[PDB]
Symmetry: C5
Subunit: 204 residues, 5 copies
């Protein structure tokens, strides 16, 4: 495991092949989760921020930016979208949580809550995933799409097997995140494939 404190993944160009695999020892299906990270991109087209596929299941858990000010969450192929006022281009801190019992998905942008949406109530997101940054998966670990590639910088990424309350979301945004049990930036297991560079985080 690697300590990425004060560092980002830079995806410096559009491609079909540049990506990072994120490795997690997750064996049981998810009833709850929270995912937080920082992103800086000047793409205007759609792109994937976080792609999580399982065997035979596309878009099992996908965070997707359709256009400026619009964020989408996919859970088992189904999707919700919430909107926000945002400057472009601008660095952004994104948190998203989902809770099976209610189906409620909560997007938080720069520590500010978006309108709640709901999907897949009672569903469990499948385990044994392939998780990739920089590309959107259409297969278990591949079938990428250049028009959906992420060009820019991603840092401070955390994933918890719980729904973070607002205080913990703000803590993540303001730079003191709670240690995370699925993915943790201070102890990340990753594989760089193609043109991805690790650099200091300079836009915080």
């Amino acid at each position: 495991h690697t300590d990425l404190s004060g560092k980002v993944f830079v995806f410096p160009r559009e491609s079909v092949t540049d990506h990072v695999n994120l490795i997690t020892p997750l064996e049981k299906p998810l009833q709850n989760f929270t995912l937080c990270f920082r992103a800086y991109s000047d793409l205007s087209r759609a792109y994937s921020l976080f792609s999580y596929n399982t065997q035979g299941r596309d878009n099992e858990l996908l965070v997707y930016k359709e256009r400026v000010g619009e964020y989408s969450l996919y859970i088992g192929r189904h999707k919700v979208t919430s909107k926000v006022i945002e400057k472009f281009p601008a660095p952004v801190h994104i948190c998203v949580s989902w809770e099976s019992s209610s189906g409620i998905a909560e997007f938080w942008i720069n520590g500010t809550p978006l309108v709640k949406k709901g999907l897949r109530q009672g569903y469990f997101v499948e385990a044994q995933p392939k998780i990739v940054l920089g590309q959107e998966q259409d297969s278990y670990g591949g079938k990428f799409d250049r028009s959906q590639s992420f060009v820019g910088e991603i840092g401070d990424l955390y994933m918890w097997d719980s729904v973070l309350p607002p205080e913990n979301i703000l803590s993540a945004y303001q730079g003191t995140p709670l240690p995370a049990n699925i993915l943790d930036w201070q102890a990340l297991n990753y594989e760089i494939r193609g043109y991805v560079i690790i650099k200091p985080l300079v836009w915080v």
Copy 2:
């Protein structure tokens, strides 16, 4: 009755089915009223905020948002509309009052008064209503329209049988409303039908 202090109804999806029925013992026709509530939605299309129908009477009392920055009140099928500068998307506190003797409708958006309008002077809004949140009624308790459904969050809903002066509107906006005798968020009788989730209010 239920105390919903610090909580909202979440209408997490577009549907023709999801709604909340609000129960009030109202047996006498309304001459005066004030209605306040908090709403958070990222719909750009038109939607119903508060739908009050009686037997044989559509839009007997309706608060309707035609588009961004435009608020409509219907009294006995008749309509008035007032405009406001507002950001989108954004949480909003809406208060609307109507007085039969003058016919004056008073919209207040985030503690700021809109231009007064007037309709149905001398009219009495009928009793024995069915009151719905989440959908727009075209019949007594039903005939909903998907394209008019409310998607998002509503809380701090209060209804008085009198016209509130500005200081009382401001108090409600600030989160310390006067006790209300038709509908009271802190003592609410309601029925959830379909996909509506009660969650803590995190956007104030």
Copy 3:
């Protein structure tokens, strides 16, 4: 006669009928005047604010709003127009002064001077007027136009027989006007016709 301190006229709907007559015993033709008032409307189309006609003379003294950010003054059928940056919709305090010796017309919007314009130097505005609020006169007391009708609220109307200095205009905008000899909101003689309601001034 009537003290309308803290009160306004509400013209709650569009019509060709609803108006307020402003009665004055003015016998001498005016050489100098200043007229101040408060207005709040969300009309986008053109409308008349202050209509002053005499026998056989249309548009003898008219304050006309052609569109957002543009104010017109008519003196003896002749026209001047000055422009201003303003939000819409927004309450506004309008002062306008005219002086025969120079012809100079000064518009003041919310205590800010507009570009001085000029018209009808040497001319005198005829006396024995019919002064109306809420409609545009095309005859001596009548002949109204629906598309020119004022929908909204008017208050703090004052009219002096002299040209007010910048310091005296700012006092009236600040809510402490000097007493006025032609029209005085703190001692006004008026006539309500049609659907016009007096209410408290809530938007200051």
Copy 4:
């Protein structure tokens, strides 16, 4: 001469005749000059601010507003233009300097420097001008153009036979200009022709 301290020329209407003649006793060719003045106009079309012609020579020295946010200087018929962010309509302080040896023209808008441009390096602007405010000259003292006429207010006009440094430009903007040897608002020899009115400066 006349002390015009705290006063403006008001050009109250669009015309082909209303102008002010400015008379300088200098009677010498110009190698260096700085011209500062205050202007307030709500014209959207192009207009002349300062027109300086010599016998047989049109546009010898001309300050010309093309459109909002665009200021032109003509030296001996050659033209430079510089851009600025400005509100419309708004009162403005304009300073412009030109130095023969370098050809450099320096526009200053509200004490803020525009991008330097250069023209007519080594040229001498001709002696014995007819200087006009309110109209654009095409002949020696005349051949005015209605569509180029200045409508609005001009005050605080000063002209030096030197290039003013930033500190001196700022002093003029602030309202404490250095004594001027070509044209001076505190000792100005002027001729009013047509409809031009002297009024106090109120928009500063």
Copy 5:
């Protein structure tokens, strides 16, 4: 060498001829560099900011502004572009760094980092350059294009043979740059060709 502290190069007109040659003792191929400078221009069309060509090689190192809010860097005819929110017209401080080992190019605009891009990883930018300000080269020292010419002002130009950390970039922006070993504004060897004028920097 000249200490150009507090001074700018002014390119006062559009031309195909006016330019400055920048002379450097660098004879070693560059692996790493940082370039910082200040620019003030009101051009809306594309223009070259810094043109660096070698024998037989066009656009070996080029800083190019295609349009408002878009900055392009060329390394060996390969291009990356980054976007920023900026006012127009407005003075700008530009820093750009490039690193061969990673290919990472970093734009900094007024001390704010843009999204990192990547190009020409492993490449060596060729030595013995002709460096021009005011025109874009298409040959070794020439072949200019009027439509790519720079009109406006440039100052505070520095170039280091290393990738500067954020602190040193900010110091340059704030007006305390570190000594620079390729090009240094405080000890610059230059050649003015055509119409270029040295003036004091007034827009800082």
